[PDB]
A = this chain, B = another copy of it.
């Protein structure tokens, strides 16, 4: 059938071995923001176990208002105090510009998106931009650690980015 069908079949085997329920608050009091990229298995990359960490993911690991919203809830309601941001090499966000993307969408749909596609040219500098977005935000101030990294999709290694 479809991939959804196969993934649902995989869930049968997952459920057989499942242990729960666990408490809602992340047991390691940490939120991870990462790209949606297919090559990043965030749990395996960082040795995360079930129940430990919030994981927030979008196209390009962009600190949008949804990321701020998700961090605010994570911190204020569920007690997380560490933030890890995970960009990576060979990101799709490096491959297009915002104007061209919007133009193509409009060409085909007749409508231009209200949202910014949020492309950027340099993953390392955009970690710095992303860290700055969090640092200056009035709603996400609870963190005791805020660190950013670029994941190398060729080596599997994290490289830290300094502001």
Contact = CB atoms under 8 A, between A and B. Distances in A.
Count of this chain's copies in the oligomeric assembly: 2
Contacts of A64: 65-66, 69
A136 interface: no
Given A59-B73, A90-B21, A92-B24, A8 B65 contact: no
A4 B22 contact: no
Contact of A76 (B24, B82, B104): B104
Interface string A52-66: 111111111010111
A128 interface: no
Contacts of A157: 11, 15, 18
Interface residues of A, number: 92
Contacts of A95: 24, 77
Given A21-B90, A38-B22, A58-B58, A7 B46 contact: yes
B4 A82 contact: yes
Contacts of A153: 20-22
B156 A11 contact: yes
B139 A113 contact: yes
Contacts of A60: 73
A9 B11 CA distance: 30
A163 interface: no
Interface of A: 2-4, 6-11, 13-15, 17-18, 20-22, 24-31, 36-41, 43-48, 50-60, 62, 64-70, 72-74, 76-78, 82, 84, 90, 92-93, 95-96, 101, 104-105, 109, 111, 113-118, 138-139, 141, 144-145, 147, 153-158
